[PDB]
Amino acid sequence: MKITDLELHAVGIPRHTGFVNKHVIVKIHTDEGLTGIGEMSDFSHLPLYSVDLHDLKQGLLSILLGQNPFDLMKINKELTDNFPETMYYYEKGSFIRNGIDNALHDLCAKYLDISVSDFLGGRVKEKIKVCYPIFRHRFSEEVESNLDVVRQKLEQGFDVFRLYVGKNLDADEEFLSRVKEEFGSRVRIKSYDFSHLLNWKDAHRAIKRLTKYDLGLEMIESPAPRNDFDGLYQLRLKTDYPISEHVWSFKQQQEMIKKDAIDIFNISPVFIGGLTSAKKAAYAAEVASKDVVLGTTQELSVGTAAMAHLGCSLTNINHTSDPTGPELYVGDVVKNRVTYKDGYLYAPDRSVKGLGIELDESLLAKYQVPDLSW
Amino acid sequence: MKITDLELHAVGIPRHTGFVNKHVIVKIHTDEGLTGIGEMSDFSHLPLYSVDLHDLKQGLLSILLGQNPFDLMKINKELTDNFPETMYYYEKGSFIRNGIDNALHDLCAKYLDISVSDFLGGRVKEKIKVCYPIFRHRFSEEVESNLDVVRQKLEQGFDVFRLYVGKNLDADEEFLSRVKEEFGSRVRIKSYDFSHLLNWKDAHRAIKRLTKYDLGLEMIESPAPRNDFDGLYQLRLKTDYPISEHVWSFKQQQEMIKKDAIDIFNISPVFIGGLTSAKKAAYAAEVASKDVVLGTTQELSVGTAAMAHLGCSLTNINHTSDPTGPELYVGDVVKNRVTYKDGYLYAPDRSVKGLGIELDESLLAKYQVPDLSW
Amino acid sequence: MKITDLELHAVGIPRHTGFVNKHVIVKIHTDEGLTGIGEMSDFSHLPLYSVDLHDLKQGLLSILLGQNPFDLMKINKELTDNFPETMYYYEKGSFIRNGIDNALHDLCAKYLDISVSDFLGGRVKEKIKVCYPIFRHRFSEEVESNLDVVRQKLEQGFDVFRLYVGKNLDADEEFLSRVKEEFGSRVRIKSYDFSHLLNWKDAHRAIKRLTKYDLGLEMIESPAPRNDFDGLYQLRLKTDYPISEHVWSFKQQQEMIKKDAIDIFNISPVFIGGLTSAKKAAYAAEVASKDVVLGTTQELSVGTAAMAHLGCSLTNINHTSDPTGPELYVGDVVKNRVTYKDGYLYAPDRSVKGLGIELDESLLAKYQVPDLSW
Amino acid sequence: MKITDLELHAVGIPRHTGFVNKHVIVKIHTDEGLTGIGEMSDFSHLPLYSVDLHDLKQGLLSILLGQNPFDLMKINKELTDNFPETMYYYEKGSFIRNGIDNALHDLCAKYLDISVSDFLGGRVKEKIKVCYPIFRHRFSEEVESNLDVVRQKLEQGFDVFRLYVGKNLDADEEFLSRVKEEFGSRVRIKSYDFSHLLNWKDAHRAIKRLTKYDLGLEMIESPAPRNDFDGLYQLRLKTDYPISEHVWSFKQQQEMIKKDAIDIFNISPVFIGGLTSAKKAAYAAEVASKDVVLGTTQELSVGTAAMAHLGCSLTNINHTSDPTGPELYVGDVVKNRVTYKDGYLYAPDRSVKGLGIELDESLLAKYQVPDLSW
Ligand SMILES: [Mg+2]
Ligand SMILES: [Mg+2]
Ligand SMILES: [Mg+2]
Ligand SMILES: [Mg+2]
Ligand SMILES: [Mg+2]
Ligand SMILES: [Mg+2]
Ligand SMILES: [Mg+2]
Ligand SMILES: [Mg+2]
Known part of the structure; x- marks a missing residue:
């Protein structure tokens, strides 16, 4: 059971107030056809610089490719090695690690045909x-x-x-x-x-x-x-x-x-x-x-x-x-x-395997944004 | 998926030095026929008193009966409520909780057809x-x-x-x-x-x-x-x-x-x-x-x-x-x-489901002991 | 002057509220016919396990048999060695040591023909x-x-x-x-x-x-x-x-x-x-x-x-x-x-030797319980 | 059982070096004829002033007269009230309280026909x-x-x-x-x-x-x-x-x-x-x-x-x-x-009642000193 590909979709969903926050929806594919989904939530926080998603995808594939999604401790250590904790509230590296680890939980749960809840202690x-x-x-x-x-x-x-x-x-x-x-x-x-x-x-x-x-x-x-x-x-x-x-x-x-x-x-x-x-x-x-x-x-x-x-x-x-x-x-x-x-x-729903949420390609396409620029 | 019965087998295996330590082998049965095994390791420590296993089985069944083994957090809170931490190295309540929680891990892993290793983070x-x-x-x-x-x-x-x-x-x-x-x-x-x-x-x-x-x-x-x-x-x-x-x-x-x-x-x-x-x-x-x-x-x-x-x-x-x-x-x-x-x-072997260890009924019978008496 | 036998009587006296607390009445016999009485008060506290009184009696006899009841410091050190302090409010070992040490005070006082009060500093x-x-x-x-x-x-x-x-x-x-x-x-x-x-x-x-x-x-x-x-x-x-x-x-x-x-x-x-x-x-x-x-x-x-x-x-x-x-x-x-x-x-009454309290065999028999089971 | 009289004998026993240390031997008499003996050891320490033994005897009789020697806690509180702890190594009040309390232990032990050892915990x-x-x-x-x-x-x-x-x-x-x-x-x-x-x-x-x-x-x-x-x-x-x-x-x-x-x-x-x-x-x-x-x-x-x-x-x-x-x-x-x-x-010898030491009137007489003067 191994990771074969990764996808990062940048999206901009406007708030009722008009301001458009940017997020990155994550997809981690495997050799058995199972895919885990995650979310690098709200990149719209200081510092006032933005991450190159093309470069990021390469860096993360370098890390995840060929790995067993169940090796959460191993993968997380490697993620932290490359995206060190910063002591800063809005460290973008945290958002990045978050999207990946959460997608991994969805992936593992789906593989086991159980809810993420049952993979987290019930x-x-x-x-x-x-x-x-x-x-x-x-x-x-x-x-x-x-x-x-x-x-x-x-x-x-x-x-x-x-x-x-x-x-x-x-x-x-x-x-x-x-x-x-x-x-x-x-x-x-x-x-x-x-x-x-x-x-x-x-x-x-x-x-x-x-x-x-x-x-x-x-x-x-x-x-x-x-x-x-x-x-x-x-x-x-x-x-x-x-x-x-x-x-x-x-x-x-x-x-x-x-x-x-x-x-x-x-x-x-x-x-x-x-x-x-x-x-x-x-x-x-x-x-x-x-x-x-x-x-x-x-x-x-x-x-x-x-x-x-x-x-x-x-x-x-x-x-x-x-x-x-x-x-x-x-x-x-x-x-x-x-x-x-x-x-x-x-x-x-505990009877629904994985995170229990499903992406909608039409909506992903609708809210699609070229990048994370400010 | 629920717990239907519990078994506590007291055993005494002599050390090469002759001293016989007593342990309690745990079996947690379910409605789907799956059984988790655990071990309340070495009860032979001070204080100089011993636990009534007949009474203990009733107390634990009262706790576990009908529960979903995947509710580890819930079950552990209940176990700790009944067998509080004592601040003492050899608190027998710890040995007891240990045997149950470990059996639960074996049970869940078996159910999911994965190694306990993959249920613990890989x-x-x-x-x-x-x-x-x-x-x-x-x-x-x-x-x-x-x-x-x-x-x-x-x-x-x-x-x-x-x-x-x-x-x-x-x-x-x-x-x-x-x-x-x-x-x-x-x-x-x-x-x-x-x-x-x-x-x-x-x-x-x-x-x-x-x-x-x-x-x-x-x-x-x-x-x-x-x-x-x-x-x-x-x-x-x-x-x-x-x-x-x-x-x-x-x-x-x-x-x-x-x-x-x-x-x-x-x-x-x-x-x-x-x-x-x-x-x-x-x-x-x-x-x-x-x-x-x-x-x-x-x-x-x-x-x-x-x-x-x-x-x-x-x-x-x-x-x-x-x-x-x-x-x-x-x-x-x-x-x-x-x-x-x-x-x-x-x-x-990570390919083996559960704990990867299997009980031997004849050996259990052979080293069987009536109780945990000193 | 030496200890020759020990007796542990488990009893259950209901509270006016109906709940029945269990206690263990202690009797320490000597070679001169004097007997000290004590009480391992209220065992009905967590942890949710119970002590085997048959085993306990053997363990305590192993400790007390043949000893001079006046060697309180020595006996208490030995009791603490076998029933270590736990840092936990309701450590059952404390209840056990309590019943024995108190019975020893009653025994010594009776031997000296004085009130326990006069053996404690007046x-x-x-x-x-x-x-x-x-x-x-x-x-x-x-x-x-x-x-x-x-x-x-x-x-x-x-x-x-x-x-x-x-x-x-x-x-x-x-x-x-x-x-x-x-x-x-x-x-x-x-x-x-x-x-x-x-x-x-x-x-x-x-x-x-x-x-x-x-x-x-x-x-x-x-x-x-x-x-x-x-x-x-x-x-x-x-x-x-x-x-x-x-x-x-x-x-x-x-x-x-x-x-x-x-x-x-x-x-x-x-x-x-x-x-x-x-x-x-x-x-x-x-x-x-x-x-x-x-x-x-x-x-x-x-x-x-x-x-x-x-x-x-x-x-x-x-x-x-x-x-x-x-x-x-x-x-x-x-x-x-x-x-x-x-x-x-x-x-x-200071004129009554010992603890100044006397057991009633009829009542001991009336409130007798087979064990400390929960 | 009560204290009826008190005696304070000042004595001076020379060291092999020639220097003569002064001590006060204590006798506490009762109504039943029993007498406890104690020692206010070595008064020869600074401060450079000496206690009036005639006055001291009156003060102590005022405290002890008519009291039950077994009321050690009570008597000691009263002794400390009159001879407060001073935080100074050689406080003469300590020597005084010492002689009285020790004599009381000898007295009580004699009364009970046991060694002071058995009155102290064995x-x-x-x-x-x-x-x-x-x-x-x-x-x-x-x-x-x-x-x-x-x-x-x-x-x-x-x-x-x-x-x-x-x-x-x-x-x-x-x-x-x-x-x-x-x-x-x-x-x-x-x-x-x-x-x-x-x-x-x-x-x-x-x-x-x-x-x-x-x-x-x-x-x-x-x-x-x-x-x-x-x-x-x-x-x-x-x-x-x-x-x-x-x-x-x-x-x-x-x-x-x-x-x-x-x-x-x-x-x-x-x-x-x-x-x-x-x-x-x-x-x-x-x-x-x-x-x-x-x-x-x-x-x-x-x-x-x-x-x-x-x-x-x-x-x-x-x-x-x-x-x-x-x-x-x-x-x-x-x-x-x-x-x-x-x-x-x-x-x-534990079979000897009291302190196990006995005074010699002859030696008391030959070593007696007029007072505690320097
Ligand atoms: Mg935000
Ligand atoms: Mg806040
Ligand atoms: Mg051990
Ligand atoms: Mg060690
Ligand atoms: Mg209580
Ligand atoms: Mg309170
Ligand atoms: Mg000196
Ligand atoms: Mg020194």
Whole structure:
């Protein structure tokens, strides 16, 4: 059983807001005709340079050609050797490794005629609670528009949201006051996300006035600069609420564990390099008796499905997660877009082998983009 | 696909030394006729009390009956809920969980018609280097006998050994001097194992005189009392050689990681509760950029095979391991025992489904024992 | 003067709630006809396995046979060698050592024709204040039932209780509000016990809202996971109230002392291995200028009497203790069940030699159980 | 059973060197005619003031009169309340409490018709290894004289000595060189005692040149100023050999434990206030997994016997102790002095009740002194 070819399809699916994110859909072919599909989700992040996909395909074929897809540990070591972890949130090498490793999981599962769920340790639950994002306000003039978003997603079933804060605290505060006023307990904002834009002391001040509003608040995310482990720790000690942070490299995670800097590890395959790497991160968290939540970069259906299977196999997810990427796009490239019901992401049909998602050649062709250029 | 019955066979296989260790061979049956086999290896350790196997079978059936063997994460959480980690090296609950989880791996692999190796992440190598143990001297009068053991195992291919030290340093020293003298570089003693019997400062003194002899020395193991994390750390700082310690609970491992107390994590399924738990421990080590070696409690072929598959799937095993249990027994309960050659333990033929080991009913009957009584 | 035989009687005494706890009553016979009695209190705790009493009797006879009961230090070292401390709250080896050491105290005292009190250092007081437990609420619907419990025990003299909290804070809060309302200062809740189910930060949040009600509150017990010494310390620093924790091993106690992690050491013979071990723990606490309280696992009269003698001999017990085990059972196996008056546990009659409690063969036969099976 | 009177006899027994040390022999009488004897050993230490024995007798009678001698915990708390621990090596209050508590142990044991050994926890061994002291050299001219002392005590059975060092390192070095030369391995110097006269760094330098000679060296004692816990710790880290220090108060011991400042706790009843306090110190050491040795202030037979019983009841004495006080005096006030054989102190005949030592009125009369004046 061996890998014989690889395909990288660049696609651009516009968000309802108009901005077009670029993704790379992965196909790994074998000698027995089985093909695994994966997704190098959202390349549209800084740094402001783009990867040559023709060159990339050659490099990856050099790595995978002739290999046994079941040698996940071996292949992942080789992938990491060529695309080293960078300690940077949006390292493009992580997105690349992610697409390949996830496609490998789909491939192996298909070969074994089982769901990716059964290749990941089975089911602990059938679905995980997720939230819809409300992006940070810059002016109080945006509050009204965001209240409309909340009302709309709420009727569609999303009763939990996460709010990006830090730019305009007066606006953040107005929004929260308005939601509490109009929706009462009908809606919950499980997280106030600072996205690393404030130093911990400024975050503490913000946290102090924002938490005046507690609508089912579960965590404060990224309340310190990237990799400021000591700052996270100090803030963790002054904050009643759990502190969460994204995991972007094992080195970074190792340091936050050693220092007991955070309470919840926000893990997402795309940022750590795939399902294999995400499981390791999740297990490291488990060994350290720490909670986990699934994060997101706004992936499409194929990338979101990966997390659906992973999330339903973990025993240490006790809070609301973030993967609602499909909700932000006008379309996708699959035959069956992932489904959200009552603010929940369900694991794909367990009787369907592989990832449980199927690509649609017509859509792949429709959203096709020449390259990943900016 | 569900579990329908469970069998626990207590057996007593005498060591070449005469002492009879007791083990419990596990069989997990399903509705489709597939059966997984496992081993609750060596119950003959303190505390000086024994488990009622009739009661145990009922308790475990209560847990497993009707479950889908592929729900490893779910089942393991339930197993840990009923047999909590104890922070004690020889917690019998660990041996119990181990036998069940390993049998589940064999069961799932058989169902999928693949080797346990392919269910664990594939192969990184086809074999791992192991060592044969030379137990601690009490009197210098024992040195000669142990030199005979070294000469015998060496001609059988074992060129690497581990030496238990700490009781009689003069005897330890004579042995090492004699081996260096007679065998030169033909033999290596990869570890000096104190087995937690000395406080770190006394170990440091011992390490100082013993390391005068360096025959391919790779590590100093358990040079401090059980759970003395601070002592291990201090000793790690004063010792040039890597410090290794057995992993017996996630809490203990978490603390040694946070404190950077050791250099090599000695992991063995039996002491941590099975393959699922051992993989998590191995991955936590990997995430922390720490080395791993496979340890042992002197298991039989079924338990040793588990480590053979695990060991060949890990990318962070860069030292010699310890599983040579079968070499200490006069027999086993399998059709074909594990295979050693030139001091290496080979992972069973990847073409064979399951664990690649098969029970022998007549041998099971032959070594059968009524209970686990002392 | 030597030990000639040993007897282990397994018994099951149902609680008023119906659940039947199993205990093992101990009898140690000598060559001079004197017999010491002890109690391996409440074996009904996880792990979910049970000890073979036939095997256990053989192992213990192997240890005790022919020994001089007055060699307590020697015998206890040997007991600990065979039943090592585990760092786990409910290590069955502790229960076993406890029953033997306590029976030895009874035996020696009888031989000397003095009360166990006079063998333990005499009297500092004649009784110690204790409290009755109110188990944790899961639903607010249980509050009424627990208020009835409080009213009933209060009229029987128990004006002090301990409350298990952490599962449903809204329910915990309602209960406390209701008691303050109905009983005012007539009743005191000396402790809010989290039983290690919350990580320290979540406990801190709970402590913050629960302590809004202070009905003679004396301590916050186990507000962190088992063995989370650093967490206890951090919480100790953020909490005005004393922090208490159970002592289950010398290693654990040593760490909480070194780190100044807690304010009150909750000591109970059953969890530390007997009177000899409990005295050492109490004295270590004294040397460290730390307060002590006697804890419980809900023992019967024989086990409770042990604590009555111990408690009245210590000079560092300045808070309310927990041993009201007999109050939860429908019966016992003694001729004289322990005395509770005005919420106080009195030390047995000092003029009666030994423990001051006598077994009742008829009751022993009535509550006899064939084994410790689950 | 109650205390009815107390007697304090001041005595002066000259050392073979001529200097006359003063001690106070204690007698505690009861209503049943039983009398306990104790010893307030060696009052001849700074500070340069002396205690009024007439006043002291009144103060102690005020405390003890009418009390039940078996109330050791109660009486000791009261003794400590009136003679608080001082954190100073030679606090006279400790000597005072010691004499009373030890007399109480003798009294209780006599009442029960058992050996003090059986009142202290029994026997673990029948004797403990001790050493003879060689006082510090000031001039190299003293070396010869001390070699004569070694040769003399060696033929009498004392093959182990302790050497006081620090004043003249050249002399210390010559002595050690001369002993190694003349006696070879016939003699051992188990400890180099600095007696707190050097700051830790100067001690380290001394330790470096003195340990060039290792004649069965077991420990380095008091290598730092009194109560310099941090200095002891730092030195403990730079020294291969165990570091030992005398225990003179629970506060001091608590700090050395918390800081892990030493390896061996040198405990002596006289410096800590008696058998009751010495046992607590020994147990605190045990709970902390630390080794213990019995120290000395050069007591007579009654005080030395106390340690003989204590020493043979402890399980954590794994090194040579120091009580050879009787060997330095020309006489005593007992009918039969303690027994040494081959460098061991034997616990008095266990079949003899009480301390196993009896006073000689004739000797008491001939050695009596008017007071404790300097
Ligand atoms: Mg975020
Ligand atoms: Mg993105
Ligand atoms: Mg080992
Ligand atoms: Mg073993
Ligand atoms: Mg409690
Ligand atoms: Mg209990
Ligand atoms: Mg000294
Ligand atoms: Mg003196």
